[PDB]
């Protein structure tokens, strides 16, 4: 019964087929690789509030 190990080693190539099968079976996702470089947050502006355009006559 020693030939079990010999047979498994010799026939091990079929695991490539098994890998292809499980690859086809598995669902897939992916990445949108993130950007670095938010090193400078930006404020709005120097903003001053005032009454609008008065309509004089």
């Amino acid at each position: 019964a020693s030939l079990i190990y010999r047979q498994l080693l010799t026939n091990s190539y079929s695991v490539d087929l098994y890998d292809e099968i499980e690859q086809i079976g598995s669902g897939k996702t992916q990445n949108v690789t993130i950007n670095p470089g938010p090193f400078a947050q930006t404020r709005y502006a120097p903003v001053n509030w005032d009454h609008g355009e008065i309509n004089d006559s």
Binding site: E53, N55, D56, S57
Partner: protein, 48 residues
């Protein structure tokens, strides 16, 4: 009175179409009365 107007011109080749409307604010309102008769001439209000 509000006056609208469209046009176009050239700016580095790419034809630019522009659309504008002009008006006034803070307009002074003068008035003149050359006479009080019906025959007389008058402008109740003219803008400057």
């Amino acid at each position: 009175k509000a006056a609208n107007y469209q046009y176009n011109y050239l700016r580095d080749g790419e034809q630019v179409t522009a659309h504008t409307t002009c008006s006034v604010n803070g307009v002074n309102n003068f008035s003149y009365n050359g006479g009080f008769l019906p025959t007389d001439f008058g402008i109740s209000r003219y803008e400057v």
